[PDB]
Amino acid sequence: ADADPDVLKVALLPDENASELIKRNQPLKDYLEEHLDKKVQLIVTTDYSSMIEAMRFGRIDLAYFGPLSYVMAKSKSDIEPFAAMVIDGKPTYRSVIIANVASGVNEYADLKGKRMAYGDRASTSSHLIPKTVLLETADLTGGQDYEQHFVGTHDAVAVNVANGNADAGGLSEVIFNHAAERGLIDPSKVKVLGYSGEYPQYPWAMRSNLSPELKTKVRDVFVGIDDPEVLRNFKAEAFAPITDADYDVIRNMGSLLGLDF
């Protein structure tokens, strides 16, 4: 492995359409090239598992993880978290549970015997969180009391609920709220059932076998971002420092999915 590579391979969690992600992250790519004296290569893998595996095998250098995919990767490889975005005045985000207006699902309890859409099995806000909400509020167990299907991206969850392939679904609040704006869905075809509580934001992480000097520079450059043109695409105010212990809440919730830490 190279401790100080000329090119940084930077992976983005595939929570949306790859073209949408590359677009959103272009100003950040430019900012990093300037302040790090590196070439940056943006990567979007096919799914969450393929991103976790690429990290374990040393094929990527930096990664923008979701909370659950981060703790899974941390259990398999030597990585360290270093920054998360502050959006709408907080370093947290929520899951939204939505229903198709034509399904007869008017509240959580009505999901009994119906079709629920989740994103990736390794997703926090499109799997772990909404599954937990349904259990705690309505005593409903996935696969036992309702049908569960995994459709991949958060974009796909919104699309499958809106077109009638699923009766209800769970996804990130922010991704849902911009789905009509992007023309993914007809907003009159869906309604909101409820929201989760607030959970820690997506962590940026890097392989720990980068040089100590390079690791310090990466941390400092991200936490120092105050350029409005980089922040605007993310609707963010800042990049905050983080620690591994900030994700213990997710480790404990993951017991429900059979994960041990």
The answer to whether 235 and 87 have CB atoms below 8 angstroms apart is: yes
Q: Please identify which residue in the block is written with the tokens 């992007």.
A: 182
Alpha-helical segments (H) within the chain: 18-36, 48-56, 67-76, 129-138, 154-163, 173-177, 212-223, 228-234, 248-253
Residue 226 and residue 239: Cα distance in Å, rounded?
A: 8
Experimental method: X-ray
- For 231, other C-beta atoms within 10 Å of its C-beta total 19
Closest CA relative to residue 109, chosen from 143, 136, 127, 129: 136
Query: CA-CA distances (angstroms) from residue 3 to 7, 58, 207, 213?
Result: 11, 11, 10, 10
What is the signed CA dihedral for 109, 185, 23, 243, rounded to 10 degrees?
-10
Q: In this structure, what are the phi and psi dihedrals at residue 209, rounded to the nearest 5 degrees?
A: -90, 5
Closest-CA residue to 240 (of 213, 211, 216, 219): 219
CA distance 259 to 156: 25
Q: Is the domain 92-199 a CATH 3.40.50.300 member?
A: no
Instruction: Measure the CA angle with vertex 69, ends 64 and 74; round to 5°.
Output: 90
